[PDB]
Symmetry: C3
Subunit: 114 residues, 3 copies
């Protein structure tokens, strides 16, 4: 599972430890070992949401399985909460795209996960 956050919050507003927190929390939420989890945060972005440049985020969570109606609702509560607490972004200014990847469509270690 791979989590990417793109935001207009500045770099200095991203707390030390945020990447590890995401890692740990996603390992709890996906039930995957943290060794398999990748996280990526992109601050200082030129973005708008509803026409406004107030703090906002555009995110993606890719996983091989563990994607679904209820699961995605749970992930959205978790990740919006983290973005709200740590980056001071309102949950109604976050979008998170979920992608259920086929194992054959994820490369790693000179091959794929098929």
């Amino acid at each position: 599972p791979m989590f990417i956050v793109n935001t207009n919050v500045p770099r200095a507003s991203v707390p030390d430890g945020f990447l590890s927190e995401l890692t740990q929390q996603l390992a709890q939420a996906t039930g995957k070992p943290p060794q398999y989890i990748a996280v990526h945060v992109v601050p200082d972005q030129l973005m708008a949401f509803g026409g406004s440049s107030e703090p906002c985020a555009l995110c993606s969570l890719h996983s091989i399985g563990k994607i679904g109606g209820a699961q995605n609702r749970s992930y959205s509560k978790l990740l919006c909460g983290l973005l709200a607490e740590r980056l001071r972004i309102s949950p109604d200014r976050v979008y998170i795209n979920y992608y259920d990847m086929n194992a054959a469509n994820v490369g790693w270690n000179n091959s794929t996960f098929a």
Copy 2:
């Protein structure tokens, strides 16, 4: 709907109100209110198109529905037109990936659609 542009055009070349035009231009085409449109522009990128570092863009438009053959054609003419007009990028140096998102696969405001 969410539109993302990545481009090698420099930041200084992105004019005032660019994000704002995108958002308005986009509300119209999709049948969505501006309130909900998200836009993202990423200048100063290290990219090539056709092996050339002349101005170019790689973009994504995500929507829950309102994606299809004719619609994507129309969006393409719209967005290529703006990128050409505002960022001086030739239309034949732009790629736009369209994604029809399932509502259950879009999160927002602690839940999904």
Copy 3:
């Protein structure tokens, strides 16, 4: 075909010619003229892989066709190979998401490829 690499390796560590090498190698690997190939490298990223900030990459390869189990394994060997050789990223610290795009879902030159 479109290849994107997001990495925490710094800009100065991306060697001269890398965008051209990627373009050339993907032309050979996909069977597609170089004029159709787009490449994008994003250094200096705030990333973690497996709860570590050692060099890593998160990548995507989009193609209209030319995507599948054996092809993707081949692409992963090639692309991890380049990332290890040129950017000193270990292949087990790379993910590559593969996307088989429908022609009607790729815009270009005021229209789509459909």
